[PDB]
Amino acid sequence: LLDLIWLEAILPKTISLAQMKASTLVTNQKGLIKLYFLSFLITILISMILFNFHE
Amino acid sequence: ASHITKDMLPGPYPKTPEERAAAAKKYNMRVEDYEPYPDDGTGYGDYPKLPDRSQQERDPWYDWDHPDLRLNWGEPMHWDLDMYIRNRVDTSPTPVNWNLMCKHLFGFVAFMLFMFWVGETYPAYQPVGPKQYPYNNLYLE
Amino acid sequence: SWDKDVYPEPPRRTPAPSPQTSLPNPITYLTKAFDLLVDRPVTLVREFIERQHAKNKYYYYHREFRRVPDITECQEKDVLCMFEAEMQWRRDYKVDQEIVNIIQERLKACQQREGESHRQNCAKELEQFTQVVKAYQDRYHDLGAHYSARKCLAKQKQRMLAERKAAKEAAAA
Amino acid sequence: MLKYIIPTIMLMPLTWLSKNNMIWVNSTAHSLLISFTSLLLMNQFGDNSLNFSLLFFSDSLSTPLLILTMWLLPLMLMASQHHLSKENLTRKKLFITMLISLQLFLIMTFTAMELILFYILFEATLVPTLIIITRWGNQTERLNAGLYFLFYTLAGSLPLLVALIYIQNTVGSLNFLMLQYWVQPVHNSWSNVFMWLACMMAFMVKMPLYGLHLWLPKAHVEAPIAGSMVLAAVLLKLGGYGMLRITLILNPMTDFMAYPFIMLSLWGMIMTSSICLRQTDLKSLIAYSSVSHMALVIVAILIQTPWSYMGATALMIAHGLTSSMLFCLANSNYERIHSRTMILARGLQTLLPLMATWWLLASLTNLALPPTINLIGELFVVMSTFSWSNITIILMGVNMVITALYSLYMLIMTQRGKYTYHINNISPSFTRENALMSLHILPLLLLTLNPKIILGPL
Amino acid sequence: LTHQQKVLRLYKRALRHLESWCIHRDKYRYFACLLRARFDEHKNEKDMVKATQLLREAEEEFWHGQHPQPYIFPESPGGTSYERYECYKVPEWCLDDWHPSEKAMYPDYFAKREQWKKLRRESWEREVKQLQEETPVGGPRTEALPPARKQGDLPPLWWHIVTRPRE
Amino acid sequence: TTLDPAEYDISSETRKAQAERLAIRSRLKREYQLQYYDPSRRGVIEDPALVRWTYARSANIYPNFRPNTKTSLLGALFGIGPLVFWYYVFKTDRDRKEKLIQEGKLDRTFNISY
Fold first, then answer.
1. Hey, which end of chain F has fewer CB within 10 Å, N or C?
2. Which chain F residues touch A if contact means CB-CB below 8 Å?
3. CB-CB under 8 Å, D428 with E89
């Protein structure tokens, strides 16, 4: 009730934590060649505003 | 190797009559006081729908038991309810609790008030005045 | 054997006689018979080996070491001279274990030889032994650096605290 | 090691080079012959110290620990042949070669001359163990247990490399333990916590605390043919000893934060043995005994100042021989009844009388009956942590209480009768079944005569 | 448990727990019909609560004052030296593997061993044939026909027919 | 004292048609005895009452488990609970024990061990 629960709850949470976020990065990369390139432009502008990159 | 009804599932209200017995004959027709409803206290992962726990208990004492193996030596077919505390635990006694055992040591707890005094043999009591005077009086002479 | 100054005992001082009666004593029946039954298979065999072992001899020597360097040598980044100063040092701690073993057996010597009084007599052991063990854990026992045995990296520095703290900082000694 | 590795690699092109079924007798013959040569140059003297040859050996001078590593390849081949002999000879030649390939790296480990030679050999294992876990088991929960055996051992051991390379370019070079004469102390800071903590935590993942023991009843429960790497995995757990090489020096003065490792591993000791008395899997019963009185060394290393190293060394090879044999008692008596359920094996002690002594003289070493190698080990630990604080006799005393009721519960389950079933279970414990069950107690009670061989520096 | 034999299982122990309470022999025996006299009050009447008050008030004065560590008949479910004969315990049919020169002894017992097994090895063409017929579907207790209508072999053959003798 | 244990009660005629619960166990015993007697078995019977006893106790607690309650979050009163208390004791010793060891003496002259 403890040795198989609250030691097994915290670290095999990490198995179910990364695979929750390994699904948001193939199923939102669903094609959309229109939407590759709208997202390259956000990356190219945010390098101008953010930090050291022009300095 | 048996896969159909291998063990329980997340119950205990998944149409309880289908559980005992598809296999695991804890109840006959889900009214046997052992239908697999007994998930006593949901939220604990222990004992799901579970042809299992809070069933009647306290001790297969392996008495006369003449059907066959019946009890604990001779192994009947499907009667395991909860174990590993029941190959060494038995039935009801004569009387009831009346905890006279703490009252038995209470007699010396009253005689701890006799630990305050001493046990000098000579003389007796003489407990009313200062004539007793435990130690000696004057000097040489 | 050994030398008796290391392992002392008083003489024997063993009373004797005292019969005084014609009552039947079994002591004349006991020692006057059984001593001969063991005298044949022991003394004749031990002497038989004693010439057979004196047929040839074998040799083993005293092993005395060389002590040129001692303590405060050498400079910090050296390895070689600070290896010899630990080979010096560890032999000066296995030996100083066993000198406590000798004096403790000296305490075992008196007490089974007197037994009855054992406290007011022999006059020496409880004075000698507690002036040696009280001279043990100070400066010769890294308490509590005893785990790594800390040869010259801490064996001097109890004794630095026995100089930098002691004898000047007592205010005013 | 001049050449102990050099003959034991020559064992490897002998197995495949051989004929048919002669491959069992050819390997076990020559493998016993190293046990003379292993003893031979080693056990020399002895007073500061035996640096052995070169950058490859400090001879495992004050901690012998290595003769026991060389019994086992001629102990496991006689054990593994029970249910292995149905596969192909091409895979039967494999399972002997990777087992030798596990003994190769352990031989350059424990000696290792360095701290960075240690790690790359500390991690040179876990590839030939994992092959014995995944292939050659039984039914499933092998594969997740093959992954729980990783990712604890490997997640912890990578911050060693960050700290050991950090020392190699900070203070000289770590390459020798005898260039560790110049050691600067490690004070109380906010970076020197992590230098202590990352260098320590990768050893805790193998010899477990009460936390992070979650992989230990996974690999031992679901386990190869007849304890065949389970005998190896009990040595490998106590082959994470290197905390004795590190923490004696190399941050010597941090006891300030020992306390979350003391109390976690001193209260966990009294509980993780208590949590096993209701086990129903027999090989998982032993698997928690291996948790408890292994974790007594973790409060014996962090507490320094010997009369503990007298005992903490003797406890590493206390149950090196005991817990090996208990697995061999359970790798046997499973070939006959095909379950590891402890309920089912009743009706015994009449059918197999000759192995009743092998149960007891196993379980009489946990009760430990003081003239053995066991209560010369615990009673130095007891008299050590008494001098830490007096109150520690309570928890460690109740440790002695519950394991008395624990060991007999495995004995007394066989003293019953009438057996109810079992037209099988005929085999009356054949000549092999007693031979590999012997050579355990035969050195175990022998060394109790002069156990000065089993001692640290100290 | 029928109401007919409900008093009877209490009647056997009503005198049995009494004799552990006496000290003489006649002290029990003078109380014999005296204990029977209260039991002979309600002789012949109905089976309802009209007569269940013999039993519904027999909880008091039987359970009240019930056998302060009574006599136990030492070969019983309880009591000392009941299941004690167990160092021998008769391990019947442990005679499978011998590697003989140990099968030299008892040449006639091993001769008679192979004779009795024909009833054991060959009874399944006859006993199991009617066993699907005599048992209709799932009925109560599984004793066969008590001669099995020609020759009872056994059905309990041979583990109940050649079982362990006590010594 | 653990327990009552309810060795006599009433009946007749509360639900008199409750019988043939023995028909379940007689069916099992007719299944078992026909299984147990045979001339060539050489091995145990499966008897999955044991199989459902281990596998519903070893596994099938964590796939069951949801932390929907606070009686499974009760374990912080039991897991980290006493481990808090053992730290509180052990730093009061080795500190009160420490100051007496430095400021003033307590042990005698013959304390080489330790």
1. N
2. 61-62, 65, 67, 72, 75, 78-79
3. no
